[PDB]
Design a protein around this ligand. Structure first.
Ligand SMILES: O=P(O)(O)O[C@H]1[C@H](OP(=O)(O)O)[C@@H](OP(=O)(O)O)[C@H](OP(=O)(O)O)[C@@H](OP(=O)(O)O)[C@H]1OP(=O)(O)O
Ligand SMILES: [Cl-]
Ligand SMILES: [Cl-]
Ligand SMILES: [Mg+2]
Length: 134
């Protein structure tokens, strides 16, 4: 069940999944529609679901990782697609081998240096590239 802010923007949560507290390498996942493209893992909040809980759930489902939830980075809008995403830091401590989206749609995941994550996100997901700006 999709959820929405009062202005009709779809509510989402996502994590920047870092390998370590150094925050030098981040986990991206393949686009569901275009698997040769990379995205930051995330998705819709469920009814009455805390944003931090949604963020952790979505990265388990999409990226097959768990870890230590860190700070809220910020709340980011995509004007064209009308969605608003809470973006958290997650320090990955567990990497699972056969996660929901790997099994269901063959979703891929890969570690990127921050500068390379920004590069591959820029063309189709410039708002996601902007998560890393600070
Ligand atoms: O841009 P929207 O209209 O909100 O639609 C998006 C988009 O799907 P499209 O392929 O239809 O543009 C995402 O696909 P990608 O970012 O992977 O290319 C998809 O993401 P995922 O399948 O990766 O989860 C996302 O879902 P979400 O916001 O839950 O991450 C889905 O929105 P819906 O699930 O609400 O249709
Ligand atoms: Cl790191
Ligand atoms: Cl976006
Ligand atoms: Mg998603």
């Amino acid at each position: 069940t999709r959820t929405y802010d009062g202005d009709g923007y779809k509510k989402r949560a996502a994590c920047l999944c870092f390998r370590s507290e150094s925050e030098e390498e981040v986990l991206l996942v393949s686009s569901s529609r275009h698997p040769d493209r990379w995205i930051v893992p995330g998705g819709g909040m469920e009814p009455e679901e805390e944003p931090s809980v949604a963020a952790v759930r979505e990265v388990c489902e999409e990226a097959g990782v768990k870890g230590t939830l860190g700070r809220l980075v910020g709340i980011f809008e995509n004007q064209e697609r009308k969605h608003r995403t809470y973006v958290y830091v997650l320090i990955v401590t567990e990497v699972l081998e056969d996660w929901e989206d790997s099994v269901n749609i063959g979703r891929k995941r890969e570690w990127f240096k921050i500068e390379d994550a920004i590069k591959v996100l820029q063309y189709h997901k410039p708002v996601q590239a902007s998560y890393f700006e600070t």
